[PDB]
């Protein structure tokens with residue numbers, strides 16, 4: 001049995017079901033493909049005896065193409081519709097023309113259709129009754145989408161009496177181009193609507209709460225936070241890491257080459273990725289001498305295991321306390337218990353100095369001080385605040401929890417680790433788990449870099465009472481990007497709301513004037 005549509009899905013689909021050329025603008029994750037399934041089904045059922053609709057669906061990316069092809073065939077083939085998909089994988093050895101003739105829904109990469117319009121294989125877009133453009137914000141410049149639309153519009157603004165298909169675009173963002181004001185952003189959006197001959201921009205307006213149970217992005221308030229003026233722990237550990245890398249790179253010339261790779265600085269997620277890469281290269285490594293293959297790989301796995309621990313401790317020192325970074329290392333080296341004994345005593349030779357720098361009060365992490373300031377402010381204003389604190393890595397979770405537990409100035413916090421009484425839960429990225437922030441009053445992104453964090457809100461408390469989100473970062477770059485993106489999104493949303501308020505004749509005339517201008521340019 002078939003999925004029940006969400007209400008906001010019906011809401012988005014409705015204008016297209018009424019036959020209007022529509023741009024559906026809805027967030028990543030809310031299931032626009034399913035909305036397009038609803039539109040296509042309704043569309044095809046419109047036709048009376050004898051008549052048959054014919055839908056073309058354009059995919060912009062190969063992986064997405066394959067997925068859509070599968071979704072559409074799975075859903076419609078069962079109902080006895082002819083469904084086909086074709087891309088460059090097969091286009092040069094089949095008759096696109098006959099595939100279009102034989103099918104009710106065709107999933108295509110667009111260049112294929114462009115090629116077959118240009119050689120007359122498909123003499124006219126009139127053969128389609130509905131065209132769906134995924135990622136439709138791409139209908140610009142000289143993209144294949146725009147090239148298809150040029151023909152559609154030449155036909156529309158010309159003297160032919162042959163009908164044109166309905167056009168529906170899907171996108172997560174109509175975008176704003178280089179607009180800085182609502183005036184310019186509205187112009188940009190009207191030009192995209194002109195490009196796709198759209199008369200409606202459909203967004204979720206009536207069923208927002210239901211949407212937000214599926215995908216939700218809160219407003220972020222960014223705050224610049226201090227960071228270390230020096231890191232002696234990091235200098236020492238970095239030296240251990242260089243020694244270790246020398247040892248590792250020399251195991252095998254062939255695998256040695258992997259250490260040539262640059263843009264993998266100590267104490268970063270890039271370094272961790274590089275390590276994953278090394279383990280990967282090892283997994284498929286082969287020599288004729290199998291015992292030696294085994295020796296090389298065992299060696300590399302040992303060395304890299306250590307490097308990974310070091311890299312993690314560096315990150316811990318970066319965002320949290322040196323002592324907890326050091327404990328992380330001590331725990332590892334104890335737990336592992338001979339290259340191993342050597343590496344172990346190489347670490348042990350630094351222990352006294354490491355302990356020294358870690359115990360030095362002047363090595364308190366100033367970033368933690370700013371985190372403290374934020375926490376103290378918010379709990380001072382609202383003592384019953386519940387908080388979710390996101391950090392960069394799994395090891396940082398334990399380090400932050402320890403910091404809170406040992407800090408008498410944070411006596412108001414009872415920390416716990418997010419599972420998937422406590423007033424603050426600590427977590428790192430773990431997709432594709434959606435976090436429900438309808439619980440908490442405060443979300444803190446603490447120097448958070450990595451995979452985006454998928455959030456939902458299972459209920460609303462009013463916008464004033466919905467959870468706050470702070471982005472704490474030491475990067476001026478990140479703060480500037482956040483600010484710019486916030487402006488873009490504001491002007492885009494206000495522009496859309498305005499356009500949605502417009503009289504249909506006003507909108508139609510505005511769009512038509514744009515289309516006339518663009519065609520006049522192209523024709524010359």
Ligand SMILES: Nc1ncnc2c1ncn2[C@@H]1O[C@H](COP(=O)(O)OP(=O)(O)NP(=O)(O)O)[C@@H](O)[C@H]1O
Pocket residue numbers: 003004005006009027028029030031032033034
């Ligand atoms: N009404 C629904 N009931 C149950 N599952 C749904 C419904 N709508 C969508 N889904 C599922 O949610 C998943 C969405 O995956 P996704 O890659 O995001 O799809 P998409 O529609 O192509 N792109 P997007 O709009 O960004 O979500 C799919 O597995 C859908 O089947």
